[PDB]
Ligand binder design. Sequence first.
Ligand code: FAD
Ligand code: NDS
Ligand code: CL
Ligand code: MG
Ligand code: MG
Ligand code: MG
Length: 485
Amino acid sequence: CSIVWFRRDLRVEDNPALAAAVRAGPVIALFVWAPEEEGHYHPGRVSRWWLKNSLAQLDSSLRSLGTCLITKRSTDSVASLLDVVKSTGASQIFFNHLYDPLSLVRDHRAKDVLTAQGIAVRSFNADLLYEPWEVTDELGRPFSMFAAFWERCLSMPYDPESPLLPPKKIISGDVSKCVADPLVFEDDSEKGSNALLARAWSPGWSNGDKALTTFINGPLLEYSKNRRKADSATTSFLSPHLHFGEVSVRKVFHLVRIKQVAWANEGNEAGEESVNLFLKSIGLREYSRYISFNHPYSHERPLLGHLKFFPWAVDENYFKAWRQGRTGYPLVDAGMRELWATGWLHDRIRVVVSSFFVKVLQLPWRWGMKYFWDTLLDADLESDALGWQYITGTLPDSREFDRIDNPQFEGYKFDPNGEYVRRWLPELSRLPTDWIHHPWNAPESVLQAAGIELGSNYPLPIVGLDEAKARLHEALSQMWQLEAA
Ligand SMILES: Cc1cc2nc3c(=O)[nH]c(=O)nc-3n(C[C@H](O)[C@H](O)[C@H](O)COP(=O)(O)OP(=O)(O)OC[C@H]3O[C@@H](n4cnc5c(N)ncnc54)[C@H](O)[C@@H]3O)c2cc1C
Ligand SMILES: CC[N+](C)(C)CCCS(=O)(=O)[O-]
Ligand SMILES: [Cl-]
Ligand SMILES: [Mg+2]
Ligand SMILES: [Mg+2]
Ligand SMILES: [Mg+2]
């Protein structure tokens, strides 16, 4: 007997822990659902919907290979492990690493209790190209900025382990345990709100594989020239899959690396450039783990502390307006609407809306992080923290803090013909392009003809940009003065 503990590595291909267990003797595939253990960050509705469906596909896969997936509902995963071993008679437990704060602690507490109880525990790398400790500078210290970190990752003395085939067969220790704990990921209310997800996404490793294939054989070529497309099938759409380990980044890296060589050979400039940008994307995810591991409280504590005494607005209805997409700035409101209705957002819009959140409204970044975590289909502690810290300016490589982006211009850059804004804001579906990104200027006749009544079915800017720069300054003057102490 041997136990495989699945957490966010929901796949049978290139799964070190699984492969080691099969090598060892029969297996018991286990998954334990213990949200309250996740604190303030228990999975949100759409994330849960994804998990529910991903686990079904996982179970189905495992069965095809010989064993079932045993699910347990509990308040303490560690305890659940013990009761499983102390019922099954397993001697070893294999699992893959996780690098978010909550996982770090629980995992140690797991190794301790289990090993100090007569159980052999082995861990592997299933989620990264290289463990954060393998990537370091010449002196041996962790890099403090992305570029340096990513340049080292790509110039390592050795290649990332190559994708392992899934088992050909699995023997299962005790099949009388297959009928286990039913897991409930939706309440009736939520079932309602989830109804359209199945129409757009197919959770699980099989479909993740399909997505990767689609991407590399299509869109990747124009990945670079499509960086300014707000709502188009120009990206990979692998993030939700990646979050639950349904797809191996090592496999992603291998396929991308083969395309890069082929395109370098052909001297296809667009392709190389697109390959570089996409790799930087994969790079940024790897970096999110790097930072979380090298700063255990990064999901709440900022890296840089130069904004320590900054007087953040704590205005509750500023927040509500942001969530509701009632800020007055078309592109920002369109993004909040798309997120609320679908749980999805292109990276550019995530920057646009989170940027507005910290510079125009000036709310605490933890609030934006939490909302995103509750509503994103690919909600990921590490990637979400990295994103917010970067936008807010608490990262060694954040852009200048005293800079406020103009949604009108962002609108011109990313949504030139107002197609995006009009898709997500029906109230503005009749407004001509000349005013789509700044309706508050538009002549009364155009608004009347469009059915738009400023302040009613579309609000006036909840805070002006000019007025915004001023409070930002006033806020700095204040924090600097608070520093004097
Ligand atoms: C404020 C903010 C919050 C974010 N929150 C999340 C989150 O909760 N979960 C999440 O996975 N990503 C998050 N991101 C990063 C990024 O927006 C998403 O990973 C990306 O939009 C997903 O689309 P894709 O799968 O098509 O990515 P692609 O462009 O196809 O790139 C492939 C993969 O690279 C990784 N990636 C790409 N860009 C980034 C990035 N900027 N940071 C980290 N990883 C990246 C993702 O795994 C992505 O799936 C956030 C970014 C910001 C600015
Ligand atoms: C445009 C990307 N969409 C289709 C919405 C998601 C990709 C499908 S999935 O779930 O198989 O990755
Ligand atoms: Cl500053
Ligand atoms: Mg794009
Ligand atoms: Mg696009
Ligand atoms: Mg970004």
